[PDB]
């Protein structure tokens, strides 16, 4: 069948333009976007310590 992606017009009224003009000018994206998704460094790293530890295999 179908699915349409990126087929939508903007709202283009008085309210939601300030919602978009807060984005371009004062960066409500790009900090909430990727100043938080990256850090998120607080997970445990997964490194096989190779001369001693070795990885899984199969028979």
């Amino acid at each position: 069948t179908y699915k349409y992606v990126n087929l939508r017009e903007p709202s283009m009224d008085m309210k939601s333009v300030t919602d978009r003009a807060a984005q371009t000018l004062l960066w409500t994206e790009l900090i909430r976007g990727l100043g938080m998704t990256l850090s998120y460094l607080f997970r445990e790293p997964a490194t096989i310590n190779y001369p001693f530890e070795k990885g899984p295999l199969s028979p």
């Binding site: 903007p10 283009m12 008085m14 333009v17 978009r20 003009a21 371009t24 000018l25």
Partner: protein, 80 residues
Amino acid sequence: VAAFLKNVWAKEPVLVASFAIAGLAVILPTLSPYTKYSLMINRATPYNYPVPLRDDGNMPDVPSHPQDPQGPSLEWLKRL
């Protein structure tokens, strides 16, 4: 024309923010009475040395003692 200030602010809100700060900057020095105090503070800051004058007939004011009630009103800044 009342849509033009809302249908270009949906397209380029970049220079609109510039004119909004370009305006409301020339306008305000004609408005608040805080200005001309900006020239009043700036007039009574002594750089050079006050040379004295001589008595000859007049004697208008301001005798040899400075701490007498002799000179003008620049002492409103200490109360400020």
